[PDB]
Amino acid sequence: KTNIEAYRDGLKLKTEEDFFACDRQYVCQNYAPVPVVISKGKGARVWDINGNEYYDFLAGVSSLSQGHCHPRVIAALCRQAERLTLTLRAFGNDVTGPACRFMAEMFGYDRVLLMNTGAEAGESALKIARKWAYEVKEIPPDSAKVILCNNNYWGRTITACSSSTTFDCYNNFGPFTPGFELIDYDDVGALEEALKDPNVAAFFVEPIQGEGGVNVPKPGYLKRAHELCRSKNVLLIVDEIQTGLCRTGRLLAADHDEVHPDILLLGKSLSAGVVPISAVMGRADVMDVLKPGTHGSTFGGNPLACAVAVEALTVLKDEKLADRAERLGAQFRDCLRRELYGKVPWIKEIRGRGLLNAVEVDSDAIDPNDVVMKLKENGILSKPTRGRVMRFIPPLVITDEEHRDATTRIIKSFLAVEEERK
Amino acid sequence: KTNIEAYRDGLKLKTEEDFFACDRQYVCQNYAPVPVVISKGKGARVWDINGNEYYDFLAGVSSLSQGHCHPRVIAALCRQAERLTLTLRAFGNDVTGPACRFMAEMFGYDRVLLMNTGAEAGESALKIARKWAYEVKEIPPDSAKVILCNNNYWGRTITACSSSTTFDCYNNFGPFTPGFELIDYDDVGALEEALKDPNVAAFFVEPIQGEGGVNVPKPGYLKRAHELCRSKNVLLIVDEIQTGLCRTGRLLAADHDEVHPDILLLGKSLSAGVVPISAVMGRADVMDVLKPGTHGSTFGGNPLACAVAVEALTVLKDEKLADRAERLGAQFRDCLRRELYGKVPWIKEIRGRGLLNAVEVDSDAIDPNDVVMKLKENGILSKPTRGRVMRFIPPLVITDEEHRDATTRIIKSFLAVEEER
Numbered sequence A: 001k002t003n004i005e006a007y008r009d010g011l012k013l014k015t016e017e018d019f020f021a022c023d024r025q026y027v028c029q030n031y032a033p034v035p036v037v038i039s040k041g042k043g044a045r046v047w048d049i050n051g052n053e054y055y056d057f058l059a060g061v062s063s064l065s066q067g068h069c070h071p072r073v074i075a076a077l078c079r080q081a082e083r084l085t086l087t088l089r090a091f092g093n094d095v096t097g098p099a100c101r102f103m104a105e106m107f108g109y110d111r112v113l114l115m116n117t118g119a120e121a122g123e124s125a126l127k128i129a130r131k132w133a134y135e136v137k138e139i140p141p142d143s144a145k146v147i148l149c150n151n152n153y154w155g156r157t158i159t160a161c162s163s164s165t166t167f168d169c170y171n172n173f174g175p176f177t178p179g180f181e182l183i184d185y186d187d188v189g190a191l192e193e194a195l196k197d198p199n200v201a202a203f204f205v206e207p208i209q210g211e212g213g214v215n216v217p218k219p220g221y222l223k224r225a226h227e228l229c230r231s232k233n234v235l236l237i238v239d240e241i242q243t244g245l246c247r248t249g250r251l252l253a254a255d256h257d258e259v260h261p262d263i264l265l266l267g268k269s270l271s272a273g274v275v276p277i278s279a280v281m282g283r284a285d286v287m288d289v290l291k292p293g294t295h296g297s298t299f300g301g302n303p304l305a306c307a308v309a310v311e312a313l314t315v316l317k318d319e320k321l322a323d324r325a326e327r328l329g330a331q332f333r334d335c336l337r338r339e340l341y342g343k344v345p346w347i348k349e350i351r352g353r354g355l356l357n358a359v360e361v362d363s364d365a366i367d368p369n370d371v372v373m374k375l376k377e378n379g380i381l382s383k384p385t386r387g388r389v390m391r392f393i394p395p396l397v398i399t400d401e402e403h404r405d406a407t408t409r410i411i412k413s414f415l416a417v418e419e420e421r422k
Numbered sequence B: 001k002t003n004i005e006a007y008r009d010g011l012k013l014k015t016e017e018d019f020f021a022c023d024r025q026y027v028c029q030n031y032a033p034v035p036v037v038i039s040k041g042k043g044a045r046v047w048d049i050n051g052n053e054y055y056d057f058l059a060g061v062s063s064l065s066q067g068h069c070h071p072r073v074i075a076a077l078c079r080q081a082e083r084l085t086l087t088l089r090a091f092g093n094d095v096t097g098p099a100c101r102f103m104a105e106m107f108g109y110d111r112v113l114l115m116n117t118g119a120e121a122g123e124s125a126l127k128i129a130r131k132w133a134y135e136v137k138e139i140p141p142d143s144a145k146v147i148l149c150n151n152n153y154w155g156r157t158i159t160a161c162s163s164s165t166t167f168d169c170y171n172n173f174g175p176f177t178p179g180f181e182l183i184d185y186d187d188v189g190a191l192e193e194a195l196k197d198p199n200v201a202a203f204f205v206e207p208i209q210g211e212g213g214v215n216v217p218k219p220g221y222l223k224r225a226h227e228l229c230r231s232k233n234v235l236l237i238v239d240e241i242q243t244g245l246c247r248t249g250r251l252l253a254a255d256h257d258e259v260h261p262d263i264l265l266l267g268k269s270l271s272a273g274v275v276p277i278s279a280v281m282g283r284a285d286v287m288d289v290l291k292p293g294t295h296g297s298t299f300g301g302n303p304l305a306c307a308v309a310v311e312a313l314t315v316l317k318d319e320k321l322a323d324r325a326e327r328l329g330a331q332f333r334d335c336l337r338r339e340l341y342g343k344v345p346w347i348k349e350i351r352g353r354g355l356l357n358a359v360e361v362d363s364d365a366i367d368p369n370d371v372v373m374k375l376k377e378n379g380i381l382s383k384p385t386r387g388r389v390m391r392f393i394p395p396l397v398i399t400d401e402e403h404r405d406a407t408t409r410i411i412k413s414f415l416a417v418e419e420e421r
């Protein structure tokens, strides 16, 4: 009945290959997808166009923590969408303020800036940190530096490309925005050395590196980093777009170290995967550098996304998804270590916190894509990062039985690829 | 009651003032909003929390061309939202491909890249142009230049600030992304000189500058610019995020000059103001420089936004909103000119195309905000740009009866402010 449905009917796409070809012909070819055509999602499950069921073990890289099509989130979208979707922040409305209050109180910050994407949240935090460094720290104009880590990921703008160490992310996209010092991740001594520069405005870091391969730092990393930064009046910007909102077994992964970020970033599951909405939060004397006219966005803070975000955030609490991720995650890692370590020599490491988990394989010893195909053959959808880091990031709403079943299927896939190697 | 409704009820916010104080306390204060508290929108109209009606003459700066809460668009949102909203482009789905084909065919391009915001579309276009210049033009490493115009606006990223001449956009946000050459808008000679640098990858331009003040260039500008760029193998990137999608009385504002942009940007009304979705479109040999892993976005091309965009775009066609914009916009400029030129001396110029109109005032002879308040007294909601440029950007679905009424109301507001002068 709707225009997309009717247009699609007219195209007579029956087979999965009919869709792959449509995609190849008309869609900018900047992804290499897994060959599946998903048509429905609910909770931890998706179905392809043929009625085949899978567990979704990417979940939007932790954008779907609440599950696909969560009924409450969908009801809140549809109720608000019938009333009002967009005013701009040029006009007041009856949603944006309350939603920013809800977030401010939930995370403990004076001010909430709403943007659309995670990359926009990072851009906005860097602009805040620079303008603050210039106007409050009074460092010389154009000299602000931001420290970031090797293999960081914060998105795909030119400034993010300019602060990346991933070849594909920056190659042939220059010239680059200046002002970035890259240090190793999970290395406190290198941070301490970089903090000797009094031009540093901020250290920008992930509690666990997401795209970089689910890299879990050593105990105390973030606590120690924060102390170093405070002692130099340098802002700690913590990117929780992938790690935040219950994924690691706590509300924020920073909580594991009892760290309250000077600037916090949220996105992804902030909307339960329904619409793009991201947040930058911080104390008043930092956030208030963004005076009227100095920053903006058409859709940032639109009342529809705000309504969705408050529902999505409430589901996290009501369904105790932090406790669920903590419990199931510990079990997943325990299972895989028990049944795969030793028996599968080409597994380099099994790592994670909560339900942010990875199995790094040795890509010289095995074709990583065999594991991906095999997993799919056994009803598990995932996409690696860096070729060799297999990722297991299911929605947090995955039931005990679904998780047990999935774990069994996942173990079986690795063993099957190992058998096949013989 | 959904969570936002129950939470808000608990805050006991009754007056407009209660809402403004809530904003000042919790919302990052990077806007100076007009004092109205909008609760609902329908078509060209909105209502505040006390049930006062207004005409929306900002329309999301042309994000709501289809009106607030277009029933077909909202029905499309809701139907798709029950089925599937996000897969990532890491997995296929049954929506993204067909929506991109729909777009490719409607606008006549080989490849469609879907992103979320207008800024992201601009970023993506600059990346494509730079990479193409390096890989196809073979210009030296890090040497790509992009030409754009004074008073341009394409967003708020650091790289957008780095290429702005607006003090508030860029001030204290550096150091800046290199590789930009700013020239005057609506100046073909300046473009021709700038194109002498063989390291230019692209000229990035708006068919009418939006935030810059609804600056309508001289006849032939875009046509002449495209020819100069082709002469030098430079890409013409046309930002139609504000001007496109029937706003100026044509499908694309570029159509006024019969210009097919080498890279086209859409955004805003691409979703009828319902969810952020933006698009970058271009020929295959340009767009295919974005190889797997070289660009991405979590929400870019998500199925929900696709279903919305297709419905949004079908509305524009089905409701003949280009013809509506042409016809009403001409009637608007003619009435304002006839009743305001000569009678109101502080109006510098009345200008626009279609329903992208502006009235620039002289702010040494009048307070800009007096006009804005009298408009609001008279039921017309607008926000100027650059202080002195009043903007009249209603939804295109505004009825004949509603548009005559609004036109009377705006004329009455300028005349009342002149009387009070």
Ligand SMILES: *Cc1c(COP(=O)(O)O)cnc(C)c1O
Pocket: A061, A116, A117, A118, A119, A120, A122, A153, A154, A155, A156, A206, A210, A211, A239, A240, A241, A242, A243, A267, A268, B296, B297, B298, B299
């Ligand atoms: C995915 C991601 C981003 C960027 O979010 P987009 O919404 O895709 O721009 C930023 N930071 C981290 C840690 C992420 O995982």
Ligand SMILES: *Cc1c(COP(=O)(O)O)cnc(C)c1O
Pocket: A296, A297, A298, A299, B061, B116, B117, B118, B119, B120, B122, B153, B154, B155, B156, B206, B210, B211, B239, B240, B241, B242, B243, B267, B268
């Ligand atoms: C509003 C606008 C943009 C930016 O779009 P956002 O979605 O606000 O980032 C870019 N270009 C033009 C011409 C615009 O009017």
